[PDB]
Amino acid sequence: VSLIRPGAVHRAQGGYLILDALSLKREGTWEAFKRALRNGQVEPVTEPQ
């Protein structure tokens, strides 16, 4: 738990998160972000190692 780096979503809580739709669709994270916002789940990136 001590090694979890925060992200934009974590820093945005209680505030306003401004993203780019072009960035979302281009980087392929749109579906993950949508399921994160709708459900409430967040998954910090884990390496397969």
Partner: protein
Amino acid sequence: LDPAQWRPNLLTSSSSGTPPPIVYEPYATAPRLFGRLDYLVDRGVWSTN
């Protein structure tokens, strides 16, 4: 004798059952549905239990 090799891994703790377990899972990835098999790397050797 490996102690961590023979121990009942607790999966679900029973509740009052009112209501019965209601597990809603937006993801359908196999690691989230059936669970994942975390491994132990002992001296560069992958081994699970």
